[PDB]
Amino acid sequence: ILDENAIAQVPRPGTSLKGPSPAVRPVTQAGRPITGFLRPSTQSGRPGTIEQAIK
Amino acid sequence: SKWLDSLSDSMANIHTFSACLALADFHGDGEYKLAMGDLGPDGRQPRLKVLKGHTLVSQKPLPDLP
Amino acid sequence: RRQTVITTMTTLKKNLADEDAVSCLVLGTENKELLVLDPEAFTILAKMSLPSVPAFLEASGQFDVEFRLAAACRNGSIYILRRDSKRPKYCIELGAQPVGLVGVHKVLVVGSNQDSLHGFTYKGKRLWTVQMPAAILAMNLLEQHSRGLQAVMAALANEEVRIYHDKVLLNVIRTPEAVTSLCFGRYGREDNTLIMTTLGGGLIIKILKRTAKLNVPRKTRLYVDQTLREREAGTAMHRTFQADLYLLRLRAARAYVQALESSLSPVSREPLKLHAVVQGLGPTFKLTLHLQNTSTARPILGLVVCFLYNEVLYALPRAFFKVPLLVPGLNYPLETFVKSLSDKGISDIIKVLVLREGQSTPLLSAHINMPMSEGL
Amino acid sequence: IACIGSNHFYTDQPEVALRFYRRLLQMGVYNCQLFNNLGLCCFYAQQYDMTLTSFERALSLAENEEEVADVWYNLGHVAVGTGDTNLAHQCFRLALVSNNQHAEAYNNLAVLEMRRGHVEQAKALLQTASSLAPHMYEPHFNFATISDKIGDLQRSYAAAKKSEAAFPDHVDTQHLIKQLEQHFA
Amino acid sequence: MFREVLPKQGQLYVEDITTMVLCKPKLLPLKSLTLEKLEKMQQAAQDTIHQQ
Amino acid sequence: KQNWLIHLYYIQKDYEACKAVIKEQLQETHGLCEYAIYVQALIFRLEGNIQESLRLFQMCAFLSPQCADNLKQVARSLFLLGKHKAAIEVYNEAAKLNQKDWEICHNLGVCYIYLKQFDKAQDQLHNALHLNRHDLTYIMLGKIFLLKGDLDKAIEIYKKAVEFSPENTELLTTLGLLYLQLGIYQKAFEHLGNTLTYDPTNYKAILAAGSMMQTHGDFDVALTKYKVVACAVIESPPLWNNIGMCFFGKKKYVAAISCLKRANYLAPLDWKILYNLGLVHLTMQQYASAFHFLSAAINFQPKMGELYMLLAVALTNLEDSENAKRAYEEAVRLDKCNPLVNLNYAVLLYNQGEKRDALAQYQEMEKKVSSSLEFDPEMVEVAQKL
Amino acid sequence: LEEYFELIDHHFELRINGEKLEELLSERAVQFRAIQRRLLTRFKDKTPAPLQHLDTLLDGTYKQVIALADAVEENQDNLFQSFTRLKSATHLVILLIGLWQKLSADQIAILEAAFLPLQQDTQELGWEETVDAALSHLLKTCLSKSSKEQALNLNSQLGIPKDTSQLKKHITLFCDRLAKGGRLCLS
């Protein structure tokens, strides 16, 4: 949240990081359905605010 | 594309409805001005604005909302 | 005093139906009246009664010959008032309150609050209907006398003006911010200007140019080889699956009896449910217990909550506390403040027993893996 | 192999996912996740002779309380498929016993409850689920459906809206939202 | 002898009556080697603390 | 009393300036407006907050205690919650104040239907008809009839309904489905095709029409009609079950069970898809999956004879014949109007060398006669043998 | 029922003050965060840039944050003392209602469970919400008969109220319907 380093703010859909539908493939968050491999760097989303992250 | 945008202003305050937005040459000499009786931001300052071309020239204060 | 208000105005011609002639006024009031006045507003010429408060007005025809006064009211209907009406005598339903109206030569148009356009005739019969991909904000009467095209300018909430006319596909224009008021007319010197006022203030001016099969999956060789091995040896598979299922029922009954025995289930007369949430990342956590009585109608009076924790790692002020009268159907969040006492990062479990006062066997239990301290 | 295997399992090809996970098992991987995945791909590829032993191996290898809960959750799915709602009930309840914050176990247990007839139990369980995982469209949709079934169109709408927030292209949620908006007007 | 004759028509839905949705079976993701080693190290630290 | 601003901020889906003007107009008049609280309540209702539209419309009723509309709105906000008894007892006083509005009658009918009071609901909707008839009255009346008794009044009331306002799709499709559940078939196709003319790609009518076409052979036309909507609803268990049965009709068993497994992954608790999976695996001679899906569907639908017959057909080919016996015993005790169960049990007994009660099964079968092209030859061959 | 309601009103006033102070502190914290992020971005840039305006805004916002934190602490302590006095008040009121209508031990325990819910107020559960939900349920399933009243006036919710009007209405209604022969049950 508090570290901003991306230049754009509304980049074109397809040029930034920010399949089976949720009726088939389970999901961890709203988007980014469950993966097959956990690396210690997977994000599967971003929490919006600080309140959204602590809660 | 079938329209020529003469003015697309983004940060001037104009809050009127199509009923209180009438156009005429209220002065004569065959050149049309645009009268708009608007309430302003909310029901505080209703002021008849007259537009001639691209920029405002006069806002007459009104007693209540038009 | 009794204070009245005028809510809509519209004018109507006198004799020749041109712009060089004079135009008689029409007005609607909050007090249920509609006033047709002399074109200069110095004498009341026609008072009219309305079955409901008006919201929009429109008028067609000539005063002496015949005038048609379409008053779209707030009560979810329109009324066409004609000559010599002791009662307006003409009502038309739409099903909701209209966001505007437009009068083309013969047919009349009404925009429904439910995001559609409905073309009626002055008689009272619905002719055609069309849906809009967004909410209709406002409409007006477009015109172009050098062409003869007279359509509707419908402002939408998706930042667009859109309609399907009889034959040609016109009124298709985008905009940065949703437009709330429209006026097509001769502005300055040109005859085809279009002024618009959007939501967040602003101002838009557009000049119109005179030059106007199924996805059935694919089955590879693995599928056929395995249906072959099942066609040859289906009995072994069936027997071994039945054996494994008997063993599975045995093990599940075993684990379920153990959980009943140790009261480890947070859901299991005495209808209750409990889960716990830990909020916070520091040496202090808000442990909130959501406790709910899940029954048709009966409260649960005598309950208490105990916390079983490591008295070295965690400091709970109130471990034991009573539970209010659990009204059936309501979630009670009961907070507590856990504090990590370990000077290093050391986590541990915390159990929560919900149990009656008199008895001594936990009605149910919850477990919380307290997260790492991340403190000092 | 794990990524292509999961993808194959979820796009109506459990046999190919089974091939991939069997390859992971041949190369000497020995986990709880691997064996849960193998039991799932077996049950859904219709290899009924290798499913439940893989699930028991997974339960043996599980080294957490979330892994045990996931394996009991999947065993409950195998039970639901086999056609026994009592074993399924016990398996979802054991998934809850092992991990109290398991929104999917709550949702499925509430579905089975509502099948039995216990509407209040089901409503409370679906509320707990949709409070634990708000991103999951299934408890929202279920709560909205069984609220609209009993009236209560306020909560039905409040739940259909969060359903559509979680999975927007869901068709049944659109039909329910349109019905409720018609009722509101 | 006689083989067993079977029905051929099958069962068809005539209406899509709404039902209750179950969550779907979950394929557990496989942990990487680095993630496994980090978990191993933190668990070992917790353990070597617990023994005192 | 300048409320036109609040009105236009409401009707414009603004709902944020409208509340500010509500605050200003309650700061100018201190209430007593009867149209600011009304519109604030309608804001809260069209936003979905009815626990506050309730109190606001109740204030409106407090301001104009002789007005049918305020009591109407309070009882509507009561009905839009779960509370129907209170809604009825507020509609009662709203009717006391005026018995000329149809909405009171219709909503009373609905609320009575919720409390299983079908007699008074029928009477209230009768009066709702006789005052100013609307389609919803017909639909709710049909609901009463269908949940209460037989269809020999529902088809008549729905016919009366569709008679006028026939371009309505809901009435047409409901009448088509009622004919289908009834004996008639040609009229069902007539009305559903009418729906398809008015609405080209609606799910309900397309699904029902595809079911009809499937039952009368015609697998390709039904498959195309499914393709019409197979993208509007990409994940629906009924569509994929019907498509799997379409393919199973035209001997495409692999694609049939692919469609049926895709449907069953989306509805693990439905017995029709499981019956179909079991039947097709009996046809492909799997006998280790057929038994699985048939036993699952038996668990989900225990009062069916065809399911036990097919479980027994699967068990007979699994080297397990005593369970086949007892399954056939359940099947013959449960089944009444399908002699194929008796024929299969007779074939099992004959091939078991029994041949004495095989004649009992043959007699039970002939007491039930219905001719499939293969159900006759094996029947007569067992006959001449006994 | 008149020197009792004064303590309830005092308690609810303290609760409302605490909620207002919490919103003020929310705003101050958001502002402090924005200014601190501006200063951070300034620190990341290599080139010099005057910023004394920014840090003298930060100091003011921080002193306001400290003030609001101390005020919230004071209000929490005042609210706790008010809650402890209200506990004794409601103890005495239940005692008097039990002596006034000859209440049995179980009918006294139901009152002691409805009116004496919790130990202190928390930011999600408080006293008035709980006691009002419990009293509404008891009035709804034990004393009231009409359904319009059971659905309109007698409503159980568990959020901070807007005023103590409903709680006091229900306590007076509870007293008077006990006086009219009504007795307490559970289901």
From Swiss-Prot, chain F:
TPR repeats lie at residues 34-67, 68-101, 102-135, 136-168, 170-202, 204-236, 237-270, 271-304, 306-338, 346-379. Its main location: cytoplasm. It is found in: Cytoplasm, Cytoskeleton, Microtubule organizing center, Centrosome; Cell projection, Cilium membrane; Cytoplasm; Cytoplasm, Cytoskeleton, Microtubule organizing center, Centrosome, Centriolar satellite. Residues 68-304 are annotated as: Interaction with PCM1. It comes from the Eukaryota. GO terms for cellular component: centriolar satellite; centrosome; ciliary basal body; ciliary membrane; cilium; cytoplasm; motile cilium; pericentriolar material. Part of BBSome complex, that contains BBS1, BBS2, BBS4, BBS5, BBS7, BBS8, BBS9 and BBIP10. Interacts with PCM1 and DCTN1. Interacts with CCDC28B. Interacts with ALDOB and C2CD3. Interacts with PKD1. Interacts with CEP290. Interacts with DLEC1. May be required for the dynein-mediated transport of pericentriolar proteins to the centrosome. Required for microtubule anchoring at the centrosome but not for microtubule nucleation. The BBSome complex is required for ciliogenesis but is dispensable for centriolar satellite function. This ciliogenic function is mediated in part by the Rab8 GDP/GTP exchange factor, which localizes to the basal body and contacts the BBSome. Rab8(GTP) enters the primary cilium and promotes extension of the ciliary membrane. This is BBSome complex member BBS4. It comes from Bos taurus (Bovine). The lineage of its organism: Eukaryota, Metazoa, Chordata, Craniata, Vertebrata. The gene is BBS4.
